[PDB]
Short mmCIF file of C-alpha atoms and ligand atoms in Angstrom, two decimals:
data_model
loop_
_atom_site.label_atom_id
_atom_site.label_comp_id
_atom_site.label_asym_id
_atom_site.label_seq_id
_atom_site.Cartn_x
_atom_site.Cartn_y
_atom_site.Cartn_z
CA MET A 1 -4.88 208.05 309.80
CA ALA A 2 -4.33 206.83 313.37
CA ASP A 3 -3.87 208.51 316.75
CA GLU A 4 -0.68 207.47 318.58
CA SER A 5 -0.85 210.06 321.37
CA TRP A 6 0.19 207.33 323.86
CA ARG A 7 3.76 207.75 322.58
CA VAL A 8 3.80 211.14 324.34
CA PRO A 9 3.90 210.58 328.12
CA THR A 10 3.45 213.36 330.65
CA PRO A 11 6.45 213.66 333.01
CA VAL A 12 6.09 211.54 336.13
CA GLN A 13 7.00 214.50 338.33
CA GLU A 14 3.68 216.03 337.22
CA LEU A 15 1.60 212.83 337.34
CA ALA A 16 2.95 212.04 340.83
CA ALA A 17 1.81 215.33 342.41
CA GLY A 18 -0.57 214.58 345.28
CA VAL A 19 -1.63 211.13 344.11
CA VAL A 20 -2.60 208.31 346.46
CA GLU A 21 -2.62 205.63 343.74
CA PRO A 22 -0.11 205.25 340.93
CA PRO A 23 -1.78 205.76 337.55
CA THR A 24 -2.45 202.42 335.88
CA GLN A 25 0.33 202.69 333.25
CA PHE A 26 2.94 202.33 336.04
CA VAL A 27 1.45 199.32 337.84
CA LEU A 28 3.37 196.06 337.45
CA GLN A 29 1.80 192.63 337.24
CA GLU A 30 1.85 190.99 340.66
CA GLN A 31 4.67 188.55 339.90
CA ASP A 32 6.82 191.37 338.45
CA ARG A 33 6.55 193.73 341.43
CA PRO A 34 9.68 194.50 343.51
CA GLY A 35 8.56 192.24 346.35
CA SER A 36 6.38 190.10 344.03
CA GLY A 37 3.35 191.24 346.07
CA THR A 38 4.98 191.72 349.48
CA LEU A 39 6.51 194.80 351.10
CA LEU A 40 9.96 193.13 351.37
CA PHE A 41 11.81 194.33 348.27
CA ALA A 42 15.38 193.14 348.81
CA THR A 43 18.01 191.45 350.96
CA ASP A 44 20.87 193.31 352.62
CA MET A 45 24.10 192.87 350.72
CA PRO A 46 26.45 190.49 352.58
CA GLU A 47 30.04 191.19 353.52
CA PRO A 48 32.56 191.82 352.10
CA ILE A 49 30.86 194.92 350.68
CA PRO A 50 32.46 195.70 347.28
CA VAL A 51 34.50 198.83 348.04
CA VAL A 52 37.66 199.95 346.23
CA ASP A 53 40.12 202.65 347.33
CA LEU A 54 40.94 204.10 343.91
CA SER A 55 44.07 205.90 345.11
CA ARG A 56 45.63 202.60 346.23
CA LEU A 57 44.62 200.56 343.18
CA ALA A 58 48.27 199.75 342.38
CA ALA A 59 48.54 197.77 345.64
CA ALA A 60 47.94 194.03 345.35
CA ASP A 61 45.44 193.82 348.21
CA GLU A 62 43.40 196.60 346.60
CA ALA A 63 43.62 195.00 343.15
CA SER A 64 42.37 191.79 344.77
CA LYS A 65 39.39 193.69 346.18
CA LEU A 66 38.54 195.10 342.75
CA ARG A 67 38.78 191.67 341.12
CA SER A 68 36.69 190.03 343.86
CA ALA A 69 34.05 192.75 343.56
CA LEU A 70 33.80 192.46 339.78
CA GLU A 71 33.58 188.65 339.89
CA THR A 72 30.93 188.63 342.61
CA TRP A 73 28.73 191.64 341.81
CA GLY A 74 29.96 193.29 338.61
CA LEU A 75 30.10 196.61 340.48
CA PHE A 76 31.80 198.30 343.41
CA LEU A 77 31.78 201.49 345.40
CA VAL A 78 34.91 203.64 344.99
CA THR A 79 36.52 205.81 347.65
CA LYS A 80 39.35 208.32 347.19
CA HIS A 81 38.32 208.74 343.54
CA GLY A 82 39.70 212.27 343.18
CA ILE A 83 36.35 214.06 342.78
CA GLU A 84 35.86 216.77 345.38
CA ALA A 85 32.74 216.56 347.53
CA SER A 86 31.91 220.17 346.65
CA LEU A 87 31.78 219.27 342.95
CA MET A 88 29.66 216.16 343.52
CA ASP A 89 27.29 218.25 345.66
CA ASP A 90 27.14 221.12 343.14
CA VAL A 91 26.43 218.99 340.06
CA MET A 92 23.59 217.28 341.90
CA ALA A 93 22.35 220.63 343.20
CA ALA A 94 22.32 221.90 339.60
CA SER A 95 20.30 218.83 338.62
CA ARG A 96 17.81 219.40 341.44
CA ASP A 97 17.55 223.06 340.46
CA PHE A 98 16.67 222.05 336.91
CA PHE A 99 14.03 219.49 337.91
CA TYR A 100 12.42 221.95 340.33
CA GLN A 101 11.72 224.44 337.52
CA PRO A 102 8.23 224.73 335.97
CA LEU A 103 7.24 222.17 333.35
CA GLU A 104 7.26 224.94 330.72
CA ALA A 105 10.89 225.76 331.49
CA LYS A 106 11.98 222.11 331.35
CA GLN A 107 10.13 221.33 328.11
CA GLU A 108 12.35 223.86 326.34
CA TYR A 109 14.83 220.94 326.41
CA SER A 110 12.26 218.21 325.61
CA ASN A 111 13.43 214.98 323.94
CA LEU A 112 10.11 214.91 322.01
CA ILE A 113 10.89 216.41 318.61
CA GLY A 114 8.07 218.73 317.65
CA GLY A 115 6.27 217.53 320.78
CA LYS A 116 5.78 214.03 319.37
CA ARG A 117 8.99 212.24 318.21
CA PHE A 118 11.15 210.54 320.84
CA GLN A 119 14.91 210.94 320.68
CA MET A 120 17.31 210.00 323.46
CA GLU A 121 18.85 213.44 324.15
CA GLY A 122 16.97 215.99 326.25
CA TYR A 123 14.47 216.22 329.08
CA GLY A 124 11.61 213.75 329.40
CA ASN A 125 11.08 210.00 329.46
CA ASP A 126 12.26 206.84 327.78
CA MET A 127 10.56 205.77 324.58
CA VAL A 128 7.00 204.44 324.78
CA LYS A 129 6.91 201.61 322.26
CA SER A 130 3.39 200.24 322.78
CA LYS A 131 0.09 201.09 324.44
CA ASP A 132 0.43 198.27 327.00
CA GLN A 133 3.97 199.15 328.09
CA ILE A 134 4.39 199.57 331.84
CA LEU A 135 6.24 202.83 332.42
CA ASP A 136 8.90 203.56 335.01
CA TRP A 137 8.35 206.04 337.86
CA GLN A 138 10.97 208.60 336.85
CA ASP A 139 11.91 211.37 334.50
CA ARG A 140 15.36 211.97 333.08
CA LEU A 141 17.54 214.52 331.36
CA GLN A 142 19.99 212.75 329.05
CA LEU A 143 22.91 214.54 327.39
CA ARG A 144 25.67 213.45 325.01
CA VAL A 145 28.89 214.64 326.67
CA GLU A 146 31.48 212.98 324.44
CA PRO A 147 32.69 213.22 321.71
CA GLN A 148 32.82 216.97 322.34
CA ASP A 149 32.19 217.85 318.68
CA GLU A 150 28.95 215.83 318.69
CA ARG A 151 27.31 217.62 321.64
CA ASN A 152 24.12 219.57 320.93
CA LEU A 153 24.35 222.36 323.50
CA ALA A 154 20.73 223.39 322.75
CA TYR A 155 19.63 220.56 325.08
CA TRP A 156 21.94 221.67 327.88
CA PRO A 157 20.04 223.61 330.59
CA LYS A 158 20.94 227.30 330.59
CA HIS A 159 19.58 227.73 334.15
CA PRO A 160 21.22 227.53 336.54
CA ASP A 161 23.88 229.18 334.38
CA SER A 162 26.68 227.03 335.83
CA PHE A 163 25.00 223.73 334.85
CA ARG A 164 27.15 223.32 331.73
CA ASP A 165 30.45 224.13 333.44
CA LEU A 166 29.65 221.83 336.35
CA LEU A 167 28.76 218.94 334.05
CA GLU A 168 31.86 219.45 331.91
CA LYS A 169 34.14 219.51 334.96
CA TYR A 170 32.43 216.49 336.52
CA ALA A 171 32.55 214.46 333.29
CA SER A 172 36.25 215.17 332.86
CA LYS A 173 36.69 213.93 336.43
CA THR A 174 34.71 210.72 335.84
CA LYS A 175 36.75 210.02 332.71
CA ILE A 176 39.86 209.84 334.90
CA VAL A 177 38.04 207.40 337.20
CA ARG A 178 36.95 205.38 334.17
CA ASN A 179 40.52 205.08 332.90
CA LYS A 180 41.91 204.13 336.30
CA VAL A 181 39.35 201.31 336.60
CA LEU A 182 39.95 200.15 333.03
CA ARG A 183 43.72 200.00 333.51
CA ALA A 184 43.30 197.89 336.65
CA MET A 185 40.99 195.56 334.69
CA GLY A 186 43.37 195.17 331.76
CA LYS A 187 46.13 194.43 334.27
CA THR A 188 44.23 191.77 336.24
CA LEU A 189 43.11 190.13 332.99
CA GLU A 190 46.75 190.20 331.76
CA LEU A 191 45.69 192.08 328.62
CA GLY A 192 47.84 195.19 329.12
CA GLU A 193 46.80 198.30 331.07
CA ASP A 194 45.65 200.15 327.95
CA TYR A 195 43.72 197.27 326.37
CA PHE A 196 40.17 198.43 327.14
CA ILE A 197 40.96 202.13 326.72
CA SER A 198 42.09 201.30 323.17
CA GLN A 199 39.14 198.98 322.50
CA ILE A 200 36.73 201.69 323.63
CA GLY A 201 38.39 204.30 321.43
CA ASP A 202 39.10 208.01 321.66
CA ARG A 203 35.76 209.12 320.16
CA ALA A 204 33.58 206.75 322.19
CA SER A 205 30.26 208.03 323.46
CA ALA A 206 29.94 209.36 326.98
CA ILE A 207 26.36 210.11 328.00
CA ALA A 208 25.10 211.89 331.13
CA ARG A 209 21.74 210.70 332.49
CA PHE A 210 20.23 212.73 335.34
CA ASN A 211 17.47 210.59 336.83
CA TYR A 212 14.63 212.09 338.84
CA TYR A 213 12.51 209.67 340.86
CA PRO A 214 9.43 211.37 342.41
CA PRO A 215 8.02 209.90 345.64
CA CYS A 216 5.51 207.15 344.94
CA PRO A 217 2.49 206.44 347.19
CA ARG A 218 2.87 202.69 346.46
CA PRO A 219 6.53 201.64 345.99
CA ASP A 220 5.42 197.99 345.96
CA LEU A 221 3.56 198.48 342.65
CA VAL A 222 6.10 200.25 340.40
CA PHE A 223 9.77 200.48 339.49
CA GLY A 224 11.68 203.73 339.64
CA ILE A 225 13.78 202.26 336.87
CA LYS A 226 13.03 198.72 335.69
CA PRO A 227 15.51 195.83 335.91
CA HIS A 228 18.20 196.25 333.28
CA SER A 229 21.88 196.01 332.55
CA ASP A 230 23.68 199.00 331.10
CA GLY A 231 24.67 198.48 327.46
CA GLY A 232 28.07 200.21 327.28
CA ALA A 233 31.45 199.39 328.78
CA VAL A 234 31.35 201.07 332.19
CA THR A 235 28.99 203.27 334.19
CA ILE A 236 30.02 205.71 336.90
CA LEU A 237 27.04 206.54 339.11
CA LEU A 238 26.49 209.31 341.65
CA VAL A 239 23.46 209.15 343.99
CA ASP A 240 22.50 212.47 345.60
CA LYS A 241 22.55 212.37 349.41
CA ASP A 242 22.88 208.56 349.13
CA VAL A 243 19.07 208.16 349.03
CA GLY A 244 18.25 204.47 348.95
CA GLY A 245 16.64 202.78 345.99
CA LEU A 246 19.36 201.07 343.97
CA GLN A 247 19.31 197.26 344.03
CA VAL A 248 21.36 194.65 342.19
CA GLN A 249 20.46 191.10 341.19
CA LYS A 250 22.66 188.09 341.92
CA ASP A 251 21.61 184.47 341.37
CA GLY A 252 17.96 185.54 341.20
CA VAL A 253 18.04 187.45 344.52
CA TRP A 254 17.73 191.23 344.74
CA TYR A 255 20.20 192.98 347.04
CA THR A 256 20.21 196.54 348.34
CA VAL A 257 23.30 198.36 347.07
CA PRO A 258 24.69 200.03 350.20
CA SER A 259 25.79 203.64 350.36
CA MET A 260 28.89 205.36 351.66
CA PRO A 261 29.10 209.16 351.84
CA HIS A 262 30.98 210.91 349.03
CA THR A 263 31.57 207.67 347.08
CA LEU A 264 30.68 206.72 343.52
CA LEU A 265 29.44 203.44 342.08
CA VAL A 266 31.21 201.73 339.16
CA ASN A 267 29.30 199.03 337.32
CA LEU A 268 30.25 197.13 334.19
CA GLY A 269 28.16 197.22 331.03
CA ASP A 270 27.19 194.53 328.52
CA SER A 271 29.86 195.63 326.05
CA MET A 272 32.49 194.93 328.70
CA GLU A 273 31.01 191.50 329.45
CA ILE A 274 31.52 190.53 325.80
CA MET A 275 35.01 192.05 325.54
CA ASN A 276 36.21 190.24 328.66
CA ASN A 277 34.63 186.88 327.71
CA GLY A 278 32.27 186.89 330.68
CA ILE A 279 35.05 186.68 333.29
CA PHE A 280 33.30 189.70 334.82
CA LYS A 281 29.64 190.20 333.96
CA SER A 282 27.29 193.16 333.54
CA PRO A 283 25.04 193.36 336.63
CA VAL A 284 21.27 193.59 336.35
CA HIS A 285 20.07 196.46 338.54
CA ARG A 286 16.92 198.42 339.38
CA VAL A 287 15.65 201.34 341.41
CA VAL A 288 12.71 201.03 343.81
CA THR A 289 10.81 204.18 344.80
CA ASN A 290 9.81 205.33 348.27
CA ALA A 291 6.81 207.16 349.66
CA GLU A 292 8.68 209.94 351.48
CA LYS A 293 11.06 211.75 349.14
CA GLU A 294 12.32 212.23 345.61
CA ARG A 295 15.56 210.53 344.58
CA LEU A 296 18.19 211.98 342.22
CA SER A 297 21.08 210.21 340.49
CA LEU A 298 23.56 210.97 337.73
CA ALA A 299 24.85 208.11 335.60
CA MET A 300 27.84 208.58 333.28
CA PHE A 301 27.60 205.89 330.59
CA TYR A 302 30.89 205.16 328.82
CA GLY A 303 30.22 203.34 325.56
CA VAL A 304 32.44 201.79 322.88
CA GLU A 305 33.08 203.40 319.49
CA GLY A 306 30.30 202.40 317.13
CA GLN A 307 32.26 200.46 314.56
CA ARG A 308 34.44 198.51 317.01
CA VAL A 309 33.77 194.77 316.93
CA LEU A 310 32.77 193.62 320.39
CA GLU A 311 34.39 190.21 320.92
CA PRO A 312 36.30 188.28 323.60
CA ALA A 313 39.83 189.63 323.85
CA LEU A 314 42.41 187.54 321.98
CA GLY A 315 44.54 187.28 325.14
CA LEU A 316 41.66 185.49 326.88
CA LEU A 317 41.43 182.91 324.07
CA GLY A 318 45.00 181.61 324.22
CA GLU A 319 45.68 177.93 324.80
CA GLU A 320 42.40 176.94 323.07
CA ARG A 321 40.26 178.68 325.70
CA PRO A 322 36.76 178.88 324.21
CA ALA A 323 34.96 182.08 323.34
CA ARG A 324 31.74 182.45 325.29
CA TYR A 325 30.25 185.34 323.27
CA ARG A 326 29.64 185.84 319.57
CA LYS A 327 31.21 188.95 318.04
CA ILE A 328 29.13 191.98 317.14
CA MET A 329 29.77 195.57 316.14
CA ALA A 330 29.12 197.91 319.07
CA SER A 331 26.53 199.99 317.19
CA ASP A 332 24.75 196.74 316.24
CA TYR A 333 24.69 195.68 319.89
CA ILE A 334 22.89 198.88 320.90
CA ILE A 335 20.40 198.38 318.05
CA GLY A 336 19.62 194.86 319.23
CA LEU A 337 19.41 196.12 322.81
CA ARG A 338 16.56 198.50 321.96
CA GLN A 339 14.45 195.66 320.50
CA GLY A 340 11.67 193.82 322.31
CA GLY A 344 11.68 188.49 329.02
CA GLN A 345 15.17 187.61 327.75
CA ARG A 346 18.06 190.06 327.78
CA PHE A 347 19.71 190.66 324.42
CA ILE A 348 23.19 189.53 325.53
CA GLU A 349 21.81 186.02 326.15
CA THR A 350 21.38 185.67 322.39
CA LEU A 351 25.16 186.12 322.00
CA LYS A 352 26.24 183.48 324.53
CA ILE A 353 27.92 180.27 323.36
O1 AKG B 1 19.37 205.82 339.79
C1 AKG B 1 20.13 204.82 339.94
O2 AKG B 1 20.74 204.63 341.04
C2 AKG B 1 20.33 203.85 338.79
C3 AKG B 1 20.36 204.52 337.41
C4 AKG B 1 20.49 203.51 336.26
O3 AKG B 1 20.50 202.33 336.46
C5 AKG B 1 20.56 204.05 334.83
O4 AKG B 1 20.26 205.26 334.59
O5 AKG B 1 20.91 203.31 333.89
CO1 CO B 2 21.52 201.36 334.81
#
């Protein structure tokens, strides 16, 4: 009937080889470009830089840093998070080893069912919904890590042969970090330390996303990953070798997210914004490319169980305090998120 072979994009790592212009499907309209047309993409983030010593989170001055960071930016760097540098280095080395393999080897894990049907899990790109869609300058391998009995290990790279063990160990380590952050948030919001852990639920999704950003000859014309907020409750992000690129939006201004060696980045998701009545909000963020080197990151997305109603916590609505978000089942929120200027969560504000 009709040819829709534009739904099947070639990996950017291939398209980026040796080019001096970005192919047209990556080029943003002038007013949408990182510097809107200029070479100045972002402002340096002002002090105090949002940094949280996770081992000292029970101390009041550290809790005050976490609260200040979440109010101001919706994210923070974490130090002393309990994840050994050797394991952070190895999981990102395993990722680099996978992306460096031949296209043939990587497409054995393709997220294009039968070579044509997008699904989220596997190696490739995000869904192409229309011919005129501007694509991001990245590829990604995305894997469902939790619940354990829902994993499809056929999409997990078999080479290098320690990829699976490294990801499993790392994910179990980021779950500890997740819970420590969530307990500190329940405490500062006076909701109980286990409030958000229980809202999220024992079988909640945890998804690993290994991002690969090839060098781009014209970083002013494309996004490595387009402006967005994460949809779940909390994201724990690891950037290999702290290569720059990540930026965060605040009051319409884009700020470079600074790096610290051996740290992780925690950012809130939209589901958390609703659950906490907007006290802390989900930050809009993006990745700009560079001309010199590839950039690798690993995001651990912690979602909320699908049938949980997302709604402002009851403890935040005492004393006739008004709800600022309509309620919505978590699976319904994700569905609305994947629909096509205005972010979906704006439709829920009251
Ligand atoms: O690569 C990064 O630093 C950001 C990744 C990100 O925003 C995402 O995968 O949702
Ligand atoms: Co993100």
